[PDB]
Amino acid sequence: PKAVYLWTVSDVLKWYRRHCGEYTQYEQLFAQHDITGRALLRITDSSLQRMGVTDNRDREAIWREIVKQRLKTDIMEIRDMERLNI
């Protein structure tokens, strides 16, 4: 399971389709804005708005997926780092 910091825009769109699949109309905003993993770890609700996800409920749903992936990422990296110790 490749770490998010290493995700290409392609890995981001695969992520999006898997988790935000019901909101497929915004998928191409992530391509157009060149959202890599590194950007995905930084963007905010405001970025999503600026990118073109104007609908509040759609935006909150996407934002909830982003936060969920960030938590998953953080946990798995901690688990990985512990295996290497130190």
Partner: protein
């Protein structure tokens, strides 16, 4: 030298060490004469005005500034 002291030419030399996809923005930073102090203070809106309309690209520049800022102040 603290980053707040860098000249526009020093900011451009720093940018030249960043991702290949950000090299296209260098002409704009040069034209506008972005100094080290201005770079440490840079915002999403200033990047948009400098021609960085892709939010992915804005975030890569902001990531790099955040790292430079931490180094500057030895955090």
């Amino acid at each position: 030298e603290p980053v707040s002291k860098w000249s526009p030419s020093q900011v451009v030399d720093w940018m030249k060490g960043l991702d290949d996809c950000l090299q296209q923005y260098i002409k704009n930073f040069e034209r506008e004469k972005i100094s080290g102090d201005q770079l440490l203070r840079i915002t999403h809106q200033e990047l948009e005005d400098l021609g960085v309309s892709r939010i992915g690209h804005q975030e890569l520049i902001l990531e790099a500034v955040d790292l430079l800022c931490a180094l500057n102040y030895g955090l």
